[PDB]
Each structure stands twice: as structure tokens, then as C-alpha cells.
Symmetry: C2
Subunit: 614 residues, 2 copies
């Protein structure tokens, strides 16, 4: 009965006794038992503790202890009982709005544990408790007053409460922004010394990400409110004095994240465009770029600053044109793009950096036909000649394309593919590129050499890279398709690969050969005699079987790695073995998989009608 | 010099010297220094070692010394997955060097043939596509190599099985020849001779070689079956009843035997092939023998699991085989029909994850294209026709039980099992609407349809909700009457629009996209019988409260989820641990089927919808 009925007796007191002192004492006893006998105190004490909160409001002290005891029952912040009791506490709507009332009180011993309790509830039944507060009249606004509390333990734990209130809840994120959240949280971060400001800067950065991430209205306010310029001082860093703390790197990671959130490729493209421009004009883009010249910067901060710059420029000419204008101070001063490509094909750089550098290269080229022409024309040199050395973009791409490192081959092929992407003009130009073979042997075009590599016992990653280039190059480009089929070795290589009984490690390659062949049909103009289109269909029927051809084509989208690649532009590869798919390439596969599939069926009698009907 | 000229004198000696005995010792010297200074011994001895083989054939002592050395230079068999492939390249640069090796294998002498076989096997492991094509083109190369299986010296035959593995890997042409040359009979006899699964490494190797000949090779599969070889598998699974003590090698051998059965009934085969084999397997009693294993004792966990997966494919889509499996019972405590034993283990929190996935696959294979079976599951949820002797759990009870369990695995499995009872069966989709669940004394029934939906707002685990929505989507697709029953409850449409419009975090975006698909299905298969939520009202609500392009982004999260492509590959559930149990294979096809058309149905206008309503 003692350690069991003992609690029952303390409960009789709180319920039954008329002297505030007797009740108060008994709640303080429970406050201490609450830790070691969490289950027992909760099952018996809870109804009673709430009654105290309802009826003993003149005695701040006893309230402070009812709350302390409740926190102790409900909280899993230490670590089941947490949600079990949270469900019981909240099943009466009014128990939470009561809690709201109690936080309007100034007494440290009432408000602090109130804050901590409500936070524990919001992290355990978020949606439910957020909804109770949202519908309460001005419930969210009043909780916002906790940021005006001069006391620090209260204000700081108040930020943590707003994290929990705001999480996954767009209506609340808007109200919180309405109530001056941005100005006030940026001021706290400014006052704590930006990235140097310890734990509280982190929880304010976390809270800001809750407010902006995928929340279009708040992002727009953030921009219209001119709050982007407040981001600029965060990145006046690096410099030197290279003992950065764990907390500083952590804080600056969260800061780079907020910038990227505002220029996310998944946003409505107007909003990202607007923020890109806003970033070029307050100097934020240019500041970040400076982080990348400095010494002292930790590698992973370097790595994410590159990924951030990438998205600040993506598809925005002034910002792309700017980025290219920058030059690193070095014996050869080297343009920015040249510098990215050197790191991308450097076997000695970490994988994570090599992927950031590629992404940056790709964002540079996106919707940028001038930049796309500038890359391609360095492979057709004319009005540049020997100064006694110098190293060019196209030289680095070729060096990577035919290198011994499958990572370099893959990166060089995808980087080239982004130079051709939605640019027929440059696909025609790249067909002009000729490679020297040996002293006194004819040259081989870049097109044919990329194709030759697929039959030479190359690693599967090299072959995947190259076939993506090849598919991108021929797609939507009939003279590409003409030049390709013109070499008689190519259609038989493809048909033999597609027909072969290849093991599972080679089936992605097999499927990409299906797509390339099918591109050479769909985008065929019939201008070449001996591989028209109907010839090619019948060759598929004869050698592979139409159904089998389509099955193999279907391997591309069923590859275990495809889906993930389709989610966003940034390379998302946990390690080298996962570098297989490119994001824009997954889009090409979706646009064409279906139209090739009909194209390929539909018989000859239909086809001469179809080649009369168009 | 005194380390590398100690090589070149010998080379000079092998070439220069005119006495056989002198050259022979020159070569014997070199051999014993081969697997020791590989690099240098390879870089200059190789052209002379070949010359030797190419002329000194009357003396088979020096030939085996030449072959041994050459194996020590080329082989990487020591190294357990460099110089190996550097020298294989050099060696095969002369087409004829390989065909000269094939000539040496015809020699009976043990000291020539055995290094010959090991050397040719190493070349094939290291550059298979090249070496395989050399051998295939030469006058009856493959055919001659088959003779090695007929060698009465075990060592040579056993290592000849390995050569045939490397010769046939990934090569459909060589696979055909080896089959035509009586490979099946001759490997099935070896297996029978060495005593089936108890026949050690030799049987493991013949099982791999059979797998090479059968997997994804339709012509070879068709020949395996027409030639009555399926009945040669039956003895392999007379794996007698009791106390265990199975060796590691016995379990390996059985795993590979089970894999061969599955090869023949693969869902990835043309359906005819698979169907014909399934029949063939019932007729010779193979299905029955595999089912006997499931009842036995002392059967290791892993062989049990894989037998379940094997039986699954044997019965999948074959009515007679499905009827047979259904009619088997355990004797257990009282009886228990097979289906019920599967379902009990599926909903058993203490069964292994892999075992729980196996029984699910089995159940799904029992229902596939089996409308009768689908009917019998669903009719048990309508318990009419049946009363109790107290005890006797049914299929339905266990499915409902699991569907409301606390364990999310059981919820997902119960919901998926249930979705397979409805597939392509409008009749049962309409019958399941009749199911009414009891709540509590004096209170209204809650239908199963609506109760499945309720769970989605009740703070359930993500896995629980993913399962339930796959079920709801399957249930409503092509069932206008189920779309009516769903919409009719007024809380359902506001709940979905709410979920889709909310700023949910990444861990919940699959559920959000599934809510969109659900909402889209109730628009696409609406017949306008329900005035409150007609087709056109719903299209407008989407615009109002979420935005159409937004709705499609959400709808698009399903195919983009990282685990989606993998699930789309094959029928068997493919989950490395419990957290990965997310998508059902057949559901992924529903998504491919409806997304383009839903997307297209949503956009249009209203004016056009008058004429789509026309």
C-alpha cells in the first residue's frame, strides 16, 4: 500500500482538504514522486492535478507545482507513457486552452513549466494540439508574447515551443509570420553574433525553416519585407582564424539551408526567380562566392556553399553571367567554370565535393544557351590559339570522358549532356567535333568514339554515363540520328546487346540501348537510305521481338535508383556506386518511354499510312 | 638484373637453345618463379611461353610447364573478390592463342589438360564477352569443350563444370549450344549420382551451371519442360522428415534447387511458359512435394521461407494449383486450412520479418487471377452461412484483427492482403461495401470502408496509413458504387483536401500524394449519382482549396518516392527490413495506370467538361 496507496492518500488531500496549505504540500509531495513513479502518479493524480489548475489560480505556488508534476508525468524529453498520458490530458479540449490562459501569467514558476509542458504536448500529439490552439481565439498570437519575455530561459524555451507549434502546420506558420516572427528572430540572431551565437541561434534558424520551407506565402513576405538583405551578414565569415566550433558549422549549415529554401527548384518558378534577383542586388550571391575563395573554411561548409551558390544561379542569367565572371587568384587566374570542371575530374577530391561541383556546373548551364554555346565551342577551337599552354573546359571534359576513372567518365558525359539539353543548335555543332587517333590515322568523331567505348569492356558506370549523353544528343535531333546510323557498326551493336541474355548487373545498360535505338526510330527523318525507320522496326521484329524490345526499354524506369533521381535536380548519391542516373535524364525517359512504345508497335500497313498522314 | 635478367637469360634460353631438355628446364625454371615475381615474369616470358605451346607439342612435359606458368601469370583465383586483366588482354590479342588452348584441352595427358582448363577458365572469368565470342566463332569450340564433362578423372570434370559456368555466363548463344549438347541430362545425372542436396560442392556447381542455362532463356526453359526434366527435380525435395542437423553445404544446395524451380515459373517469363511449367509441376507431383516440406520438422528457418516463396510462384495464377494449395491442411491443435495458416503467421508479431513477407506473397499468389478464391475471402467477412462450436478463427476475422492491430506491419499486411482480394473484381469490391463493424453496446455500425478511412485521421503510424490508402485506392478504382459510398460520408472529402493542402513535412508526403490519388479516383470514376459531390463540384473544390497544379505535384509524389521503382520491378515483396515495407507491387501498376488520365481529367476547363459530359 505504501508506494501505491501513499499516492492515493496524497490524492485524497488535494481533492478533499479545504486548506490551501494542505493541498499545496501534497502536490509538492507528488511533484517529487512524479519522477520515480511516473505510471502510478499519472493514473491516479492526473484528474486531480487539472482540478488544481482550474480552481487554485490565486496561489501561483501550488499551480507551479501542479504543472511541474504534469510535465514530469507527460514528458519524454529525457528518454509508452508520454503519448498515453498526452491523449488523456487533451481529450478534454478545454485543458489545453486552460494551459493557454496560464501562460499569460508573469510568475516564473507558473509560466516556465507551463511552456515546457505545452511543448511536450505539441511534440507528442502535434496535429491534435495544434488544432486546439488554432481554433482557440487568438491562441497563436498570445503564445507569440513569449518572445517578448525579458527573461532568457523563458524566451529561449519559447522558441522551442514555437518550433513544435509551427511544425507541419501552414495556417500557424502564416499567423506566426504575421506576428513579426521574422524581424524578431533575425534580431535575436543578430544580437547573439550570427553563426557564433551558440545553441539559441540554432533553434531560431530551425524555427525560420519551419516558417519558410515549402510555404509560398511566407517566402513571398520574406522577400517583399526585404528580409533577404539580413542574410548577408551571416556569410561575412571564413576569413581566417580557423578554429570553428561544432556549433558554428551547425549554425551556418542551417543558414545556407534557409537561402536554398528560398531558391528551391521545387518552388513556383516566379518566386525562386525573384529571390535569385534579390540575392544578386543586396550582394548575397557575391558574398557566398567569397566564402569559396577564403581559406579557413571547413570542407563540408565549402561543400554546401557550393550547393547553395548552384541554386542561387540556376536558370538566372545575370547570376550565371556573374558566376562565370569570377576568377580564383592562382598562377593561371582560371575562370570559375574551368575551376569547377578541374575539381570534378580530380580523382583526389572527395566524392561529396565532386558532386557539388557538377551540380554547380549544371545550374550554370540550365536555361543558359549562351553558356551552353561557350562550352561546346571550346571543343571546336578556332579564334583561341596557343599562348604557350592554358587549359580549357572542353579539354577537361574530353580528359574526363576518356579517363580511367568511371566517376570522371560519368561526370564528363552528364556535364556534356547539360551543354546540349534543349539546344538543337549545339547538338548540331557537337557533331562537328573530331578527335585525333594516331600519327597518320584518320580522325574519329566525338559521337562515334562515345559509341565505341560501349563495346570495349568498359565499366558499367562509364557506359551508363555515355548512353545518357547519347540519348540526350540524338533526342529531338534528326542529323544527330543520321550521323549515328551512318556508321554501319552501330545498329548491330545495339541489337546484339538488346537481344543478349545479359545478367542483372547489365540490364540498365541493356534498357538504355533500347531507348537509344528507339530514339533513332522516333526522331528518324528517313534521309538515310539503308536505315530508314520501317527498316529499323522490322529489324527489331526480326532480331529482338517487339514485346521484348519494350520490356527492355522498361528496365530504365524500374531500376531501383530511378525514382529517387526523379525527385529533384541535385545529385543524391550516398556514395560512388550510387552515381548512375541524372535528374534531367529521368525526365527525358518519362517524356519518350510512352511515345516510343506506340511508335514501335503499329504495323507496316499502318506505317505507310502514318508516313503519308505526316 | 640479378632478379630480372635471371628472367631474360631463361627467355633467351627458351628461344635460343636447340635442345628440348635445355628449353624444358628453361621453362621449368620460369614456372617456379612465376607465382612470386608475376609482374616481371609475365612482361617478357609470355611471347616465348606461347611459342613453346605453339611448337613443342610432341613433348607434353614442357607444355604443362608452359601452361602452369601462364596460369600463374594470368590467374587471380588466389585473390578473393590488376595484373590478371593486363595479361588476359595481352594473351587474347591474338585470336588464335585461345583456339590453340582449345586444341590443348583435347589432349588426354593430365599435366596438360588440367592447367589448360584452369587457364581457359581464368581467361573467361576475366574477359568473358571477348573470350566467349572467340570460342563461339571457331569450328565447334563450344561443342568440343563439353567433352570435359565426360572425363573420368574427377578433378578434371569438376573443374570442367566451372569452365562451363564461365563459358555460359550472360551468353545466350553458348547457352543454346551447351543445352543441345545434352547438358541437362548429363548434369542431372551427376546430381543424382552424388546424392542430390547432400552431394557437396560438385552439386552446387552443377546447380549454378543449370541456372546459367535456364534463367531468362526461354528456348532453354521450353526444352527443359518438353524433355520431361521437371520430374528430375522431385527427388531433390524428398528431404526426409527429421531431426535436422543439415550442413551448410546442404542448405546452399537446396537454396539453389529452389531457385531453379522458380526460374521455370518466374513472373518475368512469358505467361505461357510459366503456365505450362506450373501444370507440369502439379502433374509430376512437384508442387505436392514442396508442400510436404512446409509441414515437416527440423527444416531450417531459411529453407522454410524460400520454399514458401517457391510454392507461391508455383501456384501464382494457376487455378488447379491454387485449388490444390487451398485444399491442404495442417493437423495443428484442431485442423486449419492452408490459407488460414498463412494469415495467422502474417499477423503474428513474433514471426520473423522475412517469414511474414513469404506468407504474404503466398497468399497473394493464391488470389492472383482466382476470382473464386477472391470470393471466398470476402464472403468470410460476411460471416453469414457459418456459426460456431465456440472456437474456429476465420480468414476475415484474422484480416480485420490485423487491420486494427497495434502493430503497423500487421496493418500494412492485412490491408495489402485485403486489396488483393479485390483486384480486377468489381463484384467483390461491391460485396465488401456490405461489411459492417460493431462499435460498442447500443451504438451504430461503422462500415469497413468508412472505418478504414477514419484511421487516416486518428494519429496512426505512417506505415499503417500507406497500407490503408493503397487498399482504399484499389477498392474505389473502377467501382463507381464504392466511390458513392465513400463520398456520401461528408467528413471524407474535407479530410482529404485538408491533408493535400497542408504544409506536411517530408516524412508524410507519400500519404499526401496517396490522398490526392484517392481524391482523383473519386473524381475520375464518379457517375454523378450523388449531388453533394458531383464530378464538377469536386474539380472546383480542388481549385479552391489546394490549386490544380499543386494537386498534381502531390499526385506526383507517389511515383517519385525513393522506394517506388524497386517495388515496381517484380511481384515478390522486396524489403531489406520492416521500415521498407511501404509499396505493394500491384499497387505501383495502378499508379502507372491512373495518373496520366486523372491529371488529364483534372485539367480541361468546365466548358469542355460539358461536352465530356455530353
Amino acid at each position: 500500500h505504501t508506494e501505491a496507496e501513499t499516492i492515493q492518500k496524497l490524492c485524497d488531500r488535494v481533492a478533499s482538504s479545504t486548506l490551501l496549505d494542505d493541498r499545496r504540500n501534497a502536490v509538492r509531495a507528488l511533484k517529487s514522486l512524479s519522477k520515480k513513479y511516473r505510471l502510478e502518479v499519472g493514473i491516479q493524480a492526473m484528474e486531480h492535478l487539472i482540478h488544481v489548475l482550474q480552481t487554485d489560480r490565486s496561489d501561483s505556488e501550488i499551480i507551479g507545482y501542479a504543472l511541474d508534476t504534469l510535465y514530469n508525468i507527460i514528458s519524454n524529453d529525457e528518454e509508452d507513457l508520454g503519448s498515453q498520458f498526452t491523449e488523456i490530458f487533451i481529450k478534454q479540449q478545454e485543458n489545453v486552452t486552460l494551459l493557454l490562459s496560464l501562460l499569460e501569467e508573469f510568475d516564473f514558476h507558473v509560466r516556465w513549466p507551463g511552456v515546457k509542458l505545452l511543448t511536450s504536448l505539441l511534440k507528442q500529439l502535434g496535429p491534435q494540439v495544434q488544432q486546439i490552439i488554432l481554433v482557440s481565439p487568438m491562441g497563436v498570437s498570445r503564445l507569440m508574447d513569449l518572445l517578448a519575455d525579458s527573461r532568457e530561459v523563458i524566451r529561449n524555451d519559447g522558441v522551442l515551443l514555437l518550433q513544435a507549434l509551427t511544425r507541419s502546420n501552414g495556417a500557424i506558420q502564416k499567423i506566426v509570420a504575421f506576428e513579426n516572427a521574422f524581424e524578431r528572430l533575425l534580431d535575436i540572431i543578430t544580437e547573439e553574433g550570427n553563426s557564433d551565437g551558440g545553441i539559441v541561434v540554432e533553434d531560431c534558424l530551425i524555427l525560420l525553416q519551419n516558417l519558410l520551407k515549402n510555404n509560398n506565402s511566407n517566402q513571398n513576405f520574406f522577400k517583399e519585407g526585404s528580409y533577404i538583405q539580413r542574410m548577408k551578414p551571416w556569410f561575412e565569415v571564413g576569413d581566417e582564424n580557423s578554429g570553428w566550433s561544432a556549433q558554428k558549422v551547425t549554425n551556418l549549415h542551417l543558414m545556407l539551408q534557409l537561402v536554398r529554401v528560398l531558391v528551391s527548384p521545387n518552388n513556383p518558378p516566379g518566386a525562386t526567380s525573384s529571390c535569385q534577383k534579390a540575392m544578386f542586388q543586396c550582394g548575397l550571391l557575391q558574398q557566398l562566392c567569397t566564402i569559396l575563395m577564403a581559406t579557413g573554411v571547413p570542407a563540408d561548409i565549402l561543400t554546401e556553399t557550393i550547393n547553395t551558390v548552384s541554386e542561387v544561379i540556376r536558370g538566372c542569367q545575370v547570376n550565371q553571367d556573374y558566376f562565370a565572371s569570377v576568377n580564383a587568384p592562382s598562377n593561371p587566374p582560371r575562370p570559375a567554370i574551368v575551376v569547377l570542371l578541374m575539381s570534378m575530374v580530380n580523382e583526389r577530391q572527395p566524392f561529396v565535393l565532386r558532386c557539388a561541383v557538377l551540380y554547380c556546373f549544371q545550374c550554370f548551364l540550365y536555361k543558359n544557351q549562351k553558356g551552353q554555346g561557350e562550352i561546346v565551342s571550346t571543343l571546336l577551337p578556332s579564334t583561341i590559339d596557343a599562348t604557350g599552354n592554358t587549359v580549357s573546359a572542353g579539354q577537361l571534359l574530353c580528359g574526363g570522358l576518356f579517363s580511367t576513372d568511371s566517376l570522371s567518365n560519368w561526370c564528363a558525359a552528364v556535364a556534356l549532356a547539360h551543354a546540349l539539353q534543349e539546344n538543337a543548335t549545339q547538338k548540331e555543332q557537337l557533331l562537328r567535333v573530331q578527335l585525333a587517333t594516331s600519327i597518320g590515322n584518320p580522325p574519329v568523331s566525338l559521337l562515334q568514339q562515345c559509341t565505341n567505348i560501349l563495346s570495349q569492356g568498359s565499366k558499367i558506370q562509364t557506359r551508363v554515363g555515355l548512353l545518357m549523353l547519347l540519348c540526350t544528343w540524338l533526342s529531338n535531333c534528326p542529323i544527330a540520328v543520321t550521323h549515328f546510323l551512318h556508321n554501319s557498326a552501330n545498329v548491330p551493336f545495339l541489337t546484339g546487346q538488346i537481344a543478349e541474355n545479359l545478367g542483372e548487373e547489365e540490364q540498365l545498360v541493356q534498357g538504355l540501348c533500347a531507348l537509344l535505338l528507339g530514339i533513332s526510330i522516333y526522331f528518324n527523318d528517313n534521309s538515310l537510305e539503308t536505315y530508314m525507320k520501317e527498316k529499323l522496326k522490322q529489324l527489331i521484329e526480326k532480331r529482338i521481338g517487339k514485346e521484348n524490345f519494350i520490356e527492355k526499354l522498361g528496365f530504365i524506369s524500374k531500376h531501383e535508383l530511378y525514382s529517387r533521381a526523379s525527385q529533384k535536380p541535385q545529385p543524391n548519391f550516398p556514395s560512388p556506386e550510387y552515381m548512375i542516373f541524372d535528374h534531367e535524364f529521368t525526365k527525358l525517359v518519362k517524356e519518350l518511354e510512352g511515345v516510343i512504345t506506340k511508335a514501335i508497335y503499329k504495323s507496316s500497313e499502318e506505317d505507310k499510312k502514318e508516313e503519308e498522314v505526316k
